[PDB]
Amino acid sequence: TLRAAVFDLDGVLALPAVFGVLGRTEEALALPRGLLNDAFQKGGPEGATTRLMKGEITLSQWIPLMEENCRKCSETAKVCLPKNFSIKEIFDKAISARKINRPMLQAALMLRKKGFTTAILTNTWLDDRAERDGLAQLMCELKMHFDFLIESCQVGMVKPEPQIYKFLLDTLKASPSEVVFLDDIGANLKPARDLGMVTILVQDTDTALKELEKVTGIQLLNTPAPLPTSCNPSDMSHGYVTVKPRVRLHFVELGSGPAVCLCHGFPESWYSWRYQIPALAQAGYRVLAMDMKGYGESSAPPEIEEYCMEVLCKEMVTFLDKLGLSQAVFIGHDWGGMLVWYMALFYPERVRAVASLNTPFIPANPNMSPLESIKANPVFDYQLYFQEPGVAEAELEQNLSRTFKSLFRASDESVLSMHKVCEAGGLFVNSPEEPSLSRMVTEEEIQFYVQQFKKSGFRGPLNWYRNMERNWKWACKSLGRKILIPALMVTAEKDFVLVPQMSQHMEDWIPHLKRGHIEDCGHWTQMDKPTEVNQILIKWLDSDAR
Amino acid sequence: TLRAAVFDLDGVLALPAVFGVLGRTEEALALPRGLLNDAFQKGGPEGATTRLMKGEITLSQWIPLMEENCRKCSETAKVCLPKNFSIKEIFDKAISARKINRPMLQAALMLRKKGFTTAILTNTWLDDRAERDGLAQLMCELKMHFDFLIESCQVGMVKPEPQIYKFLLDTLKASPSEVVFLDDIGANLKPARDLGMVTILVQDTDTALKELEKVTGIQLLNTPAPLPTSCNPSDMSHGYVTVKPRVRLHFVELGSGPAVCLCHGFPESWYSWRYQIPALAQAGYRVLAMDMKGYGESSAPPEIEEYCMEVLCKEMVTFLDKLGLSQAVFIGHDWGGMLVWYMALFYPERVRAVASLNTPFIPANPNMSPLESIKANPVFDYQLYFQEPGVAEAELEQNLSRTFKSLFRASDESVLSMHKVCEAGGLFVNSPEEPSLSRMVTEEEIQFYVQQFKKSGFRGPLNWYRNMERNWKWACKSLGRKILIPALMVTAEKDFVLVPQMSQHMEDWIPHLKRGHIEDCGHWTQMDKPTEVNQILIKWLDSDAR
Ligand SMILES: CS(=O)(=O)N1CCC(NC(=O)N[C@]23C[C@H]4C[C@H](C[C@H](C4)C2)C3)CC1
Ligand SMILES: CS(=O)(=O)N1CCC(NC(=O)N[C@]23C[C@H]4C[C@H](C[C@H](C4)C2)C3)CC1
């Protein structure tokens, strides 16, 4: 029967509670016990704190009224307050020490995932201090995980007034016996109980979660490590920049701080970075995730030569110019990773830092044609199949659902043999017509790619392979250079095409290269090991690109 | 006959030249004259500097080769180099001291405006130093004003090789006698002259501009103060955020740094901030210029109550949440300025700083209905005309060209009487059917607004006036508050509706309010006095919001 869960911010979603810091201050300053808590509630509903929680006055307006209540309290207590005493300093440190109670948020997320409506109901103030950004940042991180956020100062009502609980029930569109309410202050539970709601008194997190487990029948404690937050296409800010008359690039944008540009591979989308976008934004970066030329909502001209590296790199520079960005950190994967090494070799001033996932930097061989180096590697046989225009397109567009289900699989779930693709006459000749769904992706995630490739097709994406000779001549101009800006190479142990050993001589060209290695990871790195990728990127960004 | 003008970067568009700093270093370190310039050119076409300018090696790779050339030069000169000597320190300071030669750029802009094709042809390097952002920032500011930017290190050719001048002519699609070429190095002029191009040797800027004046027949020196750079709609990054199921907000974005949100008035567009967008981005800010709800590419629902202040403010907060911005500086004008005061009163944690142009903060009167305060002011008579749905829409949509030409006029060019609008039965009853074009706007600029209002109409925009009672009740909740975050009020001397005297008691509610005043400025502040507005905003942002 339970279908909604309500949490308080202070003392349940964020720790430690403000009241906890008032008691710690009394002890530290050798003040009479309870003195600061008495001044805090001085007057009850008529008092300064009630006016503050109702939104009648701001936090900066309340500070001198609280200072006064401390003096009036100390005169009756026959005590002398120190000359260092400042309500502002006490509150600045208390508000700043508060951090998200990770196990409580994890439990809220699990309940929402299992069908629950979740909400935060808190007694809070209008913060106009010079340090108010810390609070804004906290609320933003939390509000994306809950259906509703009800703040006292916005609705003009406070807990424990009975009107605020009636307002909650009408917002949730639920009966009181369908709601669980968690709060660390007993007085605030009193009216929730009178109405018939299930209440949990939060003293410690573990005991509170055990009570929540019993009452919901869902496992919350000792649960496996959850996947990172993935973003929703319809909730993203969508950007469109025209880089040249017939070419418009589409990107998705989130966050503030140094710009980080994400470049997907074949046959993918901006959506392939869904697990990295919210994490990098939360770490302090402005993320721009591209739909590369030939894909999704970006232009897809039919001409082969529109997809040679030289053209693709020039358009990326124009993209930064039109956005008004002098520099960006470039992070690529697969074909995108190849592009970012060439952005660092040809436009170092525009690249703050460079990172590639799976794709190594391979210098061009001036003594051997690229088509003969391709024939030397039997794993790269499929690249010869991709050369004839129309051939690979017809097979890949014949059944879009089959194409993405056959490709997006973990390394143990493989269903294709990359050698003798030309002999066999196709990539899916020895493959099932209806392949099983991989453990990496959901049906809905596969359907997103199917929708994007129904508009564009495979001509644009396949043309990235039809410029071997043009790319070879252009890359031969950089054989005397070294990459001397911050660089990161991330290898994937189980990528059977882009094997880790292909990157072993990279230190000859990038002397101060930083490395990362991911075990049991296949070709589709971002969605195969999302937490590992996020950890490696954030650690490197904070040190080499700040 | 002249139709193209080519400029060099070092020593002509940017001062001082690198070579000038080499001579100053020799003098400062008591080194033999010419020693540093000899090491710089050691080897000629075989030398390290030629390989650097051709893109064969990067700047960081050239530094130790130049250091070596300095030692080989000092051994023959029988001199001892100091133990402080560092080519890296010398070049870091030289590159950093270089600033745009404002009169030269102004002259280039004037020529382009008069039909010329303009270009930069420079011998430059691939800069991979830790300080390379200074150079990237410089090139970005310059490249937006020129048709082509040809850099030696990108084309593999250097000046004075004859092949680079032939490459220039084919890019410009022009005959040599149709081109003017400016350079500070005589040797680089030599091949331009052999081909038949008009050449100007730059020793000092003033003499160079006088030569350029004689040869083009256009006045460049002693010319009036130009208007700030205005942006082109088709070159902007266009953003779309869905804030609620039926409502999508459109914005234009440029720059990097702290976020600045621009909010236009009635009946305007994001385009009303065209002169402020490039200036604020150049000052170090990330500018987001909104199409407010009811206008342009933003949603325009027909319901009146979708345009009350409470709804408009909540959507602005959702806009920041979806973009991943904890805070933004809010700058409004007219109806937008009213909105930003309410964003600071109701959501201070999300507002880094607040500024209003023309619109004062007016607290609600709890003893008087807003419709009776409106009747007390005869200038606000037109607000009663706007109340009946359909009435003002039909008159304003009857002739879109007439509407924007009648409204967008300077204070001396006024063509409407705001009193007895209801008696007369319309805003344009005593107005000409074909009004003259104002000095503030071009025909093309008027046509941009006509195109935007052809899609949307005037229902949405007029609905912002049809919530007097709802806005009054909501604002009565803030009568106990004070605005205690950084605030700026900018008054316009000749605004006959929003008169400066309407803001005189603002210090009672915003004690530390900063003020700005613009003389001879009417209602349309941004486009009436663009340079003054930019100056006032940038000075305030750099001090109160950094
Ligand atoms: C030029 S490169 O060596 O940097 N190059 C190699 C091939 C790579 N991409 C690639 O071919 N990946 C796929 C990904 C799956 C699996 C297999 C076949 C098909 C679908 C293409 C390899 C891009 C970069
Ligand atoms: C509620 S307020 O006092 O902040 N309010 C007053 C009116 C103002 N805007 C306004 O009415 N401006 C116009 C601009 C031109 C000139 C005249 C008539 C018409 C076209 C509207 C005033 C918006 C803010």
Residue numbers in the entry:
A (entry chain A), B (entry chain A): 2 to 547
Sentences reproduced from the published study:
To explore the utility of SX in a drug discovery setting, we selected a pharmaceutically relevant target – soluble epoxide hydro­lase (sEH) – as a model system. sEH is an enzyme that binds epoxides and converts them to their corresponding diols. The human protein is 62.5 kDa in size and consists of a C-terminal and an N-terminal domain connected by a short proline-rich linker. The C-terminal domain exhibits hydro­lase activity and the N-terminal domain is suggested to have phosphatase activity. Three residues within the C-terminal domain active site, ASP335, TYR383 and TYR466, make up the catalytic triad.
The large, potent ligands (compounds 1–4) have distinct chemical features, such as the adamatyl moiety of compounds 1 and 2, and the tetrahedral sulfur atoms of compounds 2 and 3 which are readily recognizable and could be unambiguously modelled in the electron-density maps. Interestingly, the fraction of indexed images varies between 6 and 69%, with compound 2 being the outlier on the low side. In comparison with previously published cryo-T structures of the same protein–ligand complexes, we found that the ligands generally bind in a similar fashion in the RT and the cryo-T structures.
